[PDB]
DNA sequence: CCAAGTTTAGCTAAACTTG
DNA sequence: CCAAGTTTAGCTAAACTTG
C-alpha cells in the first residue's frame, strides 16, 4: 500500500547510512510496487528482514517530508515543559 | 556506574518481556557490580549483545516513572524550539 | 483459510564513545 | 594506545496482525 514516487525515494535515501541491498529492496517495493515476498524469495531473506529494510527507508522519508526549517522531536518531559510543547505544535500548525 | 538494588531490579524485571539470560546478565552488572566483559566471556557473546541486555533492564527501571506529572510528548517544531525540547529531554535524563 | 507484512528480543559486526 | 562499554544496520525466529 505505502509507496514513494521516484523523487520522494531519492529524498529519503539522501545520505542515509544503509547498504545497497536495503536500497534495492525499498526501491522495488516502495517505488516499483513489487511485493516484499519477491525480495524474500530472490535474496533468501526472511520476511522480517525485508520488512525492516523497507521500514528504514519509509521512516527515513517520514523523518524528512517536513516543512524545511522544522524537525520532529519526542521525549518524556515535566508537566510544565510538556505544556509548552503542546502550544508550540499548535503555533507550528498555523504555518 | 549505573547500578540497582534488589528491590529496584525486581521492580525493573516486573512486567518486562525478557528471557532468563538477560535477567542473569543485568543482575550481574546492575546489582552485583560485575563487569559486562566477564559475562561476554562466560556466555560466549560479543560485547554489544551483553550491553543490549543490560540496557533493556536499565531502561525499564528508568521508565518506571517516577514523577508522573511527566508525560510523553511528540511534536513537529522549528529547529530553535526543537533544540530546546532536545535539551529538555537531556536535562530530564540527567535529573533521573 | 491462506498469503503477506509487522513487530521485537536477541544476536553479530564494527565503528564509535569513555575513561 | 588500550579496555570496557555503546551504538546501530542487518539478520533470525516466532508470535502477531492485515489483506
CSV table of N, CA, C and O in Angstrom, one decimal, chain A:
chain,number,residue,atom,x,y,z
A,1,UNK,N,0.8,-1.2,0.0
A,1,UNK,CA,0.0,0.0,0.0
A,1,UNK,C,0.9,1.2,0.0
A,1,UNK,O,0.8,2.0,-0.9
A,2,UNK,N,1.7,1.4,1.1
A,2,UNK,CA,2.6,2.5,1.2
A,2,UNK,C,3.6,2.5,0.0
A,2,UNK,O,4.2,1.5,-0.3
A,3,UNK,N,3.7,3.7,-0.7
A,3,UNK,CA,4.6,3.8,-1.8
A,3,UNK,C,5.2,5.2,-1.9
A,3,UNK,O,4.7,6.2,-1.3
A,4,UNK,N,6.3,5.3,-2.6
A,4,UNK,CA,7.0,6.5,-2.8
A,4,UNK,C,7.3,6.8,-4.3
A,4,UNK,O,7.7,5.9,-5.0
A,5,UNK,N,7.0,8.1,-4.7
A,5,UNK,CA,7.4,8.5,-6.0
A,5,UNK,C,8.9,8.4,-6.1
A,5,UNK,O,9.6,8.2,-5.1
A,6,UNK,N,9.4,8.4,-7.4
A,6,UNK,CA,10.9,8.4,-7.6
A,6,UNK,C,11.6,9.4,-6.8
A,6,UNK,O,12.6,9.1,-6.2
A,7,UNK,N,11.1,10.6,-6.8
A,7,UNK,CA,11.8,11.8,-6.1
A,7,UNK,C,11.7,11.7,-4.6
A,7,UNK,O,12.6,12.2,-3.9
A,8,UNK,N,10.6,11.2,-4.1
A,8,UNK,CA,10.5,11.1,-2.6
A,8,UNK,C,11.4,10.0,-2.1
A,8,UNK,O,12.0,10.1,-1.0
A,9,UNK,N,11.7,9.0,-2.9
A,9,UNK,CA,12.6,7.9,-2.6
A,9,UNK,C,14.0,8.4,-2.6
A,9,UNK,O,14.8,8.1,-1.7
A,10,UNK,N,14.3,9.3,-3.6
A,10,UNK,CA,15.7,9.9,-3.7
A,10,UNK,C,15.9,10.8,-2.5
A,10,UNK,O,17.0,10.9,-2.0
A,11,UNK,N,14.9,11.5,-2.0
A,11,UNK,CA,15.0,12.3,-0.9
A,11,UNK,C,15.2,11.5,0.4
A,11,UNK,O,16.1,11.9,1.2
A,12,UNK,N,14.5,10.4,0.5
A,12,UNK,CA,14.6,9.6,1.7
A,12,UNK,C,15.9,8.9,1.9
A,12,UNK,O,16.4,8.8,3.0
A,13,UNK,N,16.6,8.6,0.8
A,13,UNK,CA,17.8,7.8,0.9
A,13,UNK,C,19.0,8.8,0.8
A,13,UNK,O,20.2,8.3,0.7
A,14,UNK,N,18.8,10.1,0.9
A,14,UNK,CA,19.8,11.1,0.9
A,14,UNK,C,20.8,11.0,2.1
A,14,UNK,O,20.4,11.4,3.2
A,15,UNK,N,21.9,10.4,1.9
A,15,UNK,CA,22.9,10.3,3.0
A,15,UNK,C,22.6,9.3,4.1
A,15,UNK,O,23.2,9.2,5.1
A,16,UNK,N,21.5,8.6,3.9
A,16,UNK,CA,21.0,7.6,4.8
A,16,UNK,C,22.0,6.5,4.9
A,16,UNK,O,22.3,5.8,3.9
A,17,UNK,N,22.6,6.2,6.1
A,17,UNK,CA,23.5,5.1,6.3
A,17,UNK,C,22.9,3.8,6.2
A,17,UNK,O,22.3,3.3,7.1
A,18,UNK,N,22.9,3.2,5.0
A,18,UNK,CA,22.2,2.0,4.7
A,18,UNK,C,22.9,1.3,3.5
A,18,UNK,O,23.3,1.9,2.5
A,19,UNK,N,23.0,-0.1,3.5
A,19,UNK,CA,23.6,-0.8,2.5
A,19,UNK,C,22.9,-0.7,1.2
A,19,UNK,O,21.7,-0.2,1.1
A,20,UNK,N,23.5,-1.3,0.1
A,20,UNK,CA,22.9,-1.2,-1.2
A,20,UNK,C,21.7,-2.1,-1.4
A,20,UNK,O,20.8,-1.9,-2.1
A,21,UNK,N,21.8,-3.2,-0.7
A,21,UNK,CA,20.7,-4.2,-0.7
A,21,UNK,C,19.4,-3.6,-0.2
A,21,UNK,O,18.3,-3.7,-0.8
A,22,UNK,N,19.5,-3.0,1.0
A,22,UNK,CA,18.3,-2.3,1.6
A,22,UNK,C,17.7,-1.3,0.6
A,22,UNK,O,16.5,-1.1,0.5
A,23,UNK,N,18.6,-0.5,-0.1
A,23,UNK,CA,18.2,0.5,-1.0
A,23,UNK,C,17.4,-0.2,-2.2
A,23,UNK,O,16.3,0.3,-2.6
A,24,UNK,N,17.9,-1.3,-2.7
A,24,UNK,CA,17.3,-2.0,-3.8
A,24,UNK,C,16.0,-2.6,-3.4
A,24,UNK,O,15.0,-2.5,-4.2
A,25,UNK,N,15.9,-3.1,-2.2
A,25,UNK,CA,14.7,-3.7,-1.7
A,25,UNK,C,13.6,-2.6,-1.6
A,25,UNK,O,12.5,-2.8,-2.2
A,26,UNK,N,13.9,-1.5,-1.0
A,26,UNK,CA,12.9,-0.4,-0.9
A,26,UNK,C,12.5,0.2,-2.2
A,26,UNK,O,11.4,0.5,-2.4
A,27,UNK,N,13.5,0.2,-3.1
A,27,UNK,CA,13.2,0.7,-4.5
A,27,UNK,C,12.2,-0.1,-5.2
A,27,UNK,O,11.2,0.4,-5.8
A,28,UNK,N,12.3,-1.5,-5.1
A,28,UNK,CA,11.4,-2.4,-5.8
A,28,UNK,C,10.1,-2.4,-5.1
A,28,UNK,O,9.0,-2.6,-5.8
A,29,UNK,N,10.0,-2.2,-3.8
A,29,UNK,CA,8.8,-2.2,-3.0
A,29,UNK,C,8.1,-0.9,-3.0
A,29,UNK,O,6.9,-0.8,-3.3
A,30,UNK,N,8.8,0.2,-2.6
A,30,UNK,CA,8.1,1.5,-2.4
A,30,UNK,C,8.0,2.3,-3.7
A,30,UNK,O,7.0,3.1,-3.8
A,31,UNK,N,8.8,2.1,-4.7
A,31,UNK,CA,8.8,2.8,-5.9
A,31,UNK,C,8.2,2.0,-7.1
A,31,UNK,O,7.3,2.4,-7.8
A,32,UNK,N,8.7,0.8,-7.2
A,32,UNK,CA,8.2,-0.1,-8.3
A,32,UNK,C,7.0,-1.0,-7.9
A,32,UNK,O,6.5,-1.7,-8.7
A,33,UNK,N,6.7,-0.9,-6.6
A,33,UNK,CA,5.5,-1.6,-6.1
A,33,UNK,C,5.5,-3.1,-6.0
A,33,UNK,O,4.5,-3.7,-5.8
A,34,UNK,N,6.7,-3.7,-6.2
A,34,UNK,CA,6.8,-5.1,-6.0
A,34,UNK,C,6.5,-5.5,-4.6
A,34,UNK,O,6.9,-4.8,-3.7
A,35,UNK,N,5.9,-6.7,-4.4
A,35,UNK,CA,5.7,-7.2,-3.1
A,35,UNK,C,7.0,-7.5,-2.4
A,35,UNK,O,8.0,-7.6,-3.0
A,36,UNK,N,6.9,-7.6,-1.0
A,36,UNK,CA,8.2,-7.8,-0.3
A,36,UNK,C,8.6,-9.3,-0.3
A,36,UNK,O,9.7,-9.6,-0.1
A,37,UNK,N,7.6,-10.1,-0.7
A,37,UNK,CA,7.9,-11.6,-0.8
A,37,UNK,C,8.9,-11.9,-1.9
A,37,UNK,O,9.7,-12.8,-1.8
A,38,UNK,N,8.9,-11.1,-2.9
A,38,UNK,CA,9.8,-11.3,-4.1
A,38,UNK,C,11.3,-11.2,-3.7
A,38,UNK,O,12.1,-12.0,-4.1
A,39,UNK,N,11.5,-10.2,-2.8
A,39,UNK,CA,12.9,-9.9,-2.4
A,39,UNK,C,13.3,-10.9,-1.3
A,39,UNK,O,14.4,-11.3,-1.1
A,40,UNK,N,12.2,-11.4,-0.6
A,40,UNK,CA,12.5,-12.5,0.4
A,40,UNK,C,12.8,-13.8,-0.4
A,40,UNK,O,13.8,-14.5,0.0
A,41,UNK,N,12.1,-14.1,-1.4
A,41,UNK,CA,12.3,-15.3,-2.3
A,41,UNK,C,13.7,-15.2,-3.0
A,41,UNK,O,14.5,-16.1,-3.0
A,42,UNK,N,13.9,-14.0,-3.7
A,42,UNK,CA,15.1,-13.9,-4.5
A,42,UNK,C,16.4,-13.7,-3.8
A,42,UNK,O,17.5,-14.0,-4.3
A,43,UNK,N,16.3,-13.2,-2.6
A,43,UNK,CA,17.5,-12.9,-1.8
A,43,UNK,C,17.8,-13.9,-0.7
A,43,UNK,O,18.8,-13.9,0.0
A,44,UNK,N,16.8,-14.8,-0.5
A,44,UNK,CA,16.9,-15.8,0.5
A,44,UNK,C,16.9,-15.2,1.9
A,44,UNK,O,17.5,-15.6,2.8
A,45,UNK,N,16.1,-14.1,2.0
A,45,UNK,CA,15.9,-13.4,3.3
A,45,UNK,C,14.6,-13.7,3.9
A,45,UNK,O,13.6,-14.0,3.2
A,46,UNK,N,14.5,-13.7,5.2
A,46,UNK,CA,13.3,-13.9,5.9
A,46,UNK,C,12.3,-12.7,5.8
A,46,UNK,O,12.8,-11.6,5.4
A,47,UNK,N,11.1,-13.0,6.0
A,47,UNK,CA,10.0,-11.9,5.9
A,47,UNK,C,10.3,-10.7,6.8
A,47,UNK,O,10.0,-9.6,6.4
A,48,UNK,N,10.9,-11.0,7.9
A,48,UNK,CA,11.3,-10.0,8.9
A,48,UNK,C,12.3,-9.0,8.3
A,48,UNK,O,12.1,-7.8,8.4
A,49,UNK,N,13.4,-9.5,7.7
A,49,UNK,CA,14.4,-8.7,7.2
A,49,UNK,C,14.0,-7.7,6.1
A,49,UNK,O,14.2,-6.5,6.3
A,50,UNK,N,13.3,-8.2,5.1
A,50,UNK,CA,12.8,-7.3,4.0
A,50,UNK,C,11.9,-6.2,4.6
A,50,UNK,O,12.0,-5.1,4.2
A,51,UNK,N,11.1,-6.6,5.6
A,51,UNK,CA,10.1,-5.6,6.2
A,51,UNK,C,10.9,-4.5,7.0
A,51,UNK,O,10.5,-3.4,6.9
A,52,UNK,N,11.9,-4.9,7.7
A,52,UNK,CA,12.7,-4.0,8.4
A,52,UNK,C,13.5,-3.1,7.5
A,52,UNK,O,13.7,-1.9,7.7
A,53,UNK,N,13.9,-3.7,6.3
A,53,UNK,CA,14.6,-2.9,5.3
A,53,UNK,C,13.8,-1.8,4.7
A,53,UNK,O,14.2,-0.7,4.6
A,54,UNK,N,12.6,-2.2,4.3
A,54,UNK,CA,11.6,-1.2,3.7
A,54,UNK,C,11.2,-0.2,4.7
A,54,UNK,O,11.1,1.0,4.4
A,55,UNK,N,11.1,-0.6,6.0
A,55,UNK,CA,10.8,0.3,7.1
A,55,UNK,C,11.7,1.4,7.3
A,55,UNK,O,11.3,2.5,7.5
A,56,UNK,N,13.0,1.1,7.2
A,56,UNK,CA,14.1,2.1,7.4
A,56,UNK,C,13.9,3.3,6.4
A,56,UNK,O,13.9,4.4,6.8
A,57,UNK,N,13.8,2.9,5.1
A,57,UNK,CA,13.6,3.9,4.1
A,57,UNK,C,12.3,4.7,4.2
A,57,UNK,O,12.3,5.9,3.9
A,58,UNK,N,11.3,4.0,4.6
A,58,UNK,CA,10.0,4.7,4.8
A,58,UNK,C,10.1,5.6,6.0
A,58,UNK,O,9.6,6.8,5.9
A,59,UNK,N,10.6,5.2,7.1
A,59,UNK,CA,10.8,6.0,8.3
A,59,UNK,C,11.7,7.2,8.0
A,59,UNK,O,11.5,8.3,8.4
A,60,UNK,N,12.7,6.9,7.2
A,60,UNK,CA,13.6,8.0,6.7
A,60,UNK,C,12.8,9.1,6.0
A,60,UNK,O,13.0,10.3,6.3
A,61,UNK,N,11.9,8.7,5.1
A,61,UNK,CA,11.1,9.6,4.4
A,61,UNK,C,10.2,10.4,5.3
A,61,UNK,O,10.0,11.6,5.1
A,62,UNK,N,9.7,9.8,6.4
A,62,UNK,CA,8.9,10.4,7.4
A,62,UNK,C,9.7,11.4,8.3
A,62,UNK,O,9.1,12.3,8.8
A,63,UNK,N,11.0,11.1,8.4
A,63,UNK,CA,11.9,12.0,9.1
A,63,UNK,C,12.2,13.2,8.3
A,63,UNK,O,12.6,14.2,8.9
A,64,UNK,N,12.2,13.1,7.0
A,64,UNK,CA,12.2,14.2,6.1
A,64,UNK,C,10.7,14.4,5.8
A,64,UNK,O,9.8,14.0,6.6
A,65,UNK,N,10.4,15.1,4.7
A,65,UNK,CA,9.0,15.3,4.3
A,65,UNK,C,8.3,16.2,5.4
A,65,UNK,O,7.1,16.0,5.7
A,66,UNK,N,9.1,17.0,6.0
A,66,UNK,CA,8.6,18.0,7.0
A,66,UNK,C,8.9,19.4,6.3
A,66,UNK,O,9.8,19.5,5.5
A,67,UNK,N,8.1,20.4,6.7
A,67,UNK,CA,8.4,21.7,6.2
A,67,UNK,C,9.9,22.1,6.5
A,67,UNK,O,10.3,21.9,7.7
A,68,UNK,N,10.6,22.6,5.6
A,68,UNK,CA,12.0,22.9,5.8
A,68,UNK,C,12.2,23.9,6.9
A,68,UNK,O,11.5,25.0,6.9
A,69,UNK,N,13.2,23.7,7.8
A,69,UNK,CA,13.4,24.5,9.0
A,69,UNK,C,12.7,24.0,10.2
A,69,UNK,O,12.7,24.6,11.2
A,70,UNK,N,12.2,22.8,10.0
A,70,UNK,CA,11.5,22.1,11.1
A,70,UNK,C,12.1,20.7,11.4
A,70,UNK,O,13.0,20.3,10.7
A,71,UNK,N,11.7,20.1,12.5
A,71,UNK,CA,12.1,18.7,12.8
A,71,UNK,C,11.1,18.1,13.8
A,71,UNK,O,10.5,18.8,14.6
A,72,UNK,N,11.0,16.7,13.7
A,72,UNK,CA,10.2,16.0,14.7
A,72,UNK,C,11.0,15.6,15.9
A,72,UNK,O,12.1,15.1,15.8
A,73,UNK,N,10.4,15.9,17.1
A,73,UNK,CA,11.1,15.5,18.4
A,73,UNK,C,10.1,14.8,19.3
A,73,UNK,O,8.9,15.1,19.2
A,74,UNK,N,10.6,13.9,20.1
A,74,UNK,CA,9.8,13.2,21.1
A,74,UNK,C,10.6,13.0,22.3
A,74,UNK,O,11.8,12.7,22.3
A,75,UNK,N,9.9,13.1,23.5
A,75,UNK,CA,10.5,12.9,24.8
A,75,UNK,C,9.5,12.9,25.9
A,75,UNK,O,8.4,13.4,25.7
A,76,UNK,N,9.8,12.3,27.0
A,76,UNK,CA,9.0,12.4,28.2
A,76,UNK,C,9.6,13.6,29.0
A,76,UNK,O,10.8,13.7,29.3
A,77,UNK,N,8.7,14.5,29.4
A,77,UNK,CA,9.1,15.8,30.0
A,77,UNK,C,8.2,16.1,31.2
A,77,UNK,O,7.1,15.6,31.2
A,78,UNK,N,8.6,17.0,32.1
A,78,UNK,CA,7.8,17.5,33.1
A,78,UNK,C,6.5,18.1,32.6
A,78,UNK,O,6.5,18.6,31.5
A,79,UNK,N,5.5,18.2,33.5
A,79,UNK,CA,4.2,18.7,33.2
A,79,UNK,C,4.3,20.1,32.5
A,79,UNK,O,3.6,20.5,31.6
A,80,UNK,N,5.2,21.0,33.0
A,80,UNK,CA,5.4,22.3,32.5
A,80,UNK,C,5.9,22.3,31.1
A,80,UNK,O,5.3,22.9,30.2
A,81,UNK,N,7.0,21.7,30.9
A,81,UNK,CA,7.7,21.6,29.6
A,81,UNK,C,6.8,20.8,28.6
A,81,UNK,O,6.8,21.1,27.4
A,82,UNK,N,6.0,19.9,29.1
A,82,UNK,CA,5.0,19.2,28.3
A,82,UNK,C,4.0,20.2,27.8
A,82,UNK,O,3.6,20.1,26.6
A,83,UNK,N,3.6,21.1,28.7
A,83,UNK,CA,2.6,22.1,28.3
A,83,UNK,C,3.1,23.0,27.2
A,83,UNK,O,2.4,23.3,26.3
A,84,UNK,N,4.3,23.5,27.4
A,84,UNK,CA,4.9,24.4,26.4
A,84,UNK,C,4.9,23.8,25.0
A,84,UNK,O,4.5,24.4,24.0
A,85,UNK,N,5.4,22.6,24.9
A,85,UNK,CA,5.5,21.8,23.7
A,85,UNK,C,4.1,21.7,23.0
A,85,UNK,O,4.0,21.9,21.8
A,86,UNK,N,3.1,21.5,23.8
A,86,UNK,CA,1.7,21.4,23.3
A,86,UNK,C,1.4,22.7,22.5
A,86,UNK,O,0.9,22.6,21.4
A,87,UNK,N,1.7,23.8,23.1
A,87,UNK,CA,1.4,25.1,22.5
A,87,UNK,C,2.2,25.3,21.2
A,87,UNK,O,1.7,25.7,20.2
A,88,UNK,N,3.5,25.0,21.3
A,88,UNK,CA,4.4,25.2,20.2
A,88,UNK,C,4.0,24.4,18.9
A,88,UNK,O,4.1,25.0,17.8
A,89,UNK,N,3.4,23.2,19.1
A,89,UNK,CA,2.9,22.5,18.0
A,89,UNK,C,1.7,23.1,17.4
A,89,UNK,O,1.4,23.0,16.2
A,90,UNK,N,0.9,23.8,18.2
A,90,UNK,CA,-0.3,24.5,17.7
A,90,UNK,C,0.1,25.7,16.9
A,90,UNK,O,-0.4,25.9,15.8
A,91,UNK,N,1.1,26.4,17.4
A,91,UNK,CA,1.6,27.6,16.6
A,91,UNK,C,2.3,27.1,15.4
A,91,UNK,O,2.3,27.8,14.4
A,92,UNK,N,2.9,25.9,15.4
A,92,UNK,CA,3.6,25.3,14.3
A,92,UNK,C,2.6,24.9,13.3
A,92,UNK,O,2.8,25.0,12.1
A,93,UNK,N,1.4,24.5,13.7
A,93,UNK,CA,0.3,24.2,12.8
A,93,UNK,C,-0.5,25.4,12.4
A,93,UNK,O,-1.8,25.3,12.2
A,94,UNK,N,0.1,26.5,12.3
A,94,UNK,CA,-0.5,27.7,11.8
A,94,UNK,C,0.3,28.1,10.5
A,94,UNK,O,-0.3,28.7,9.6
A,95,UNK,N,1.5,27.6,10.4
A,95,UNK,CA,2.4,27.9,9.3
A,95,UNK,C,2.7,26.6,8.5
A,95,UNK,O,1.9,25.7,8.6
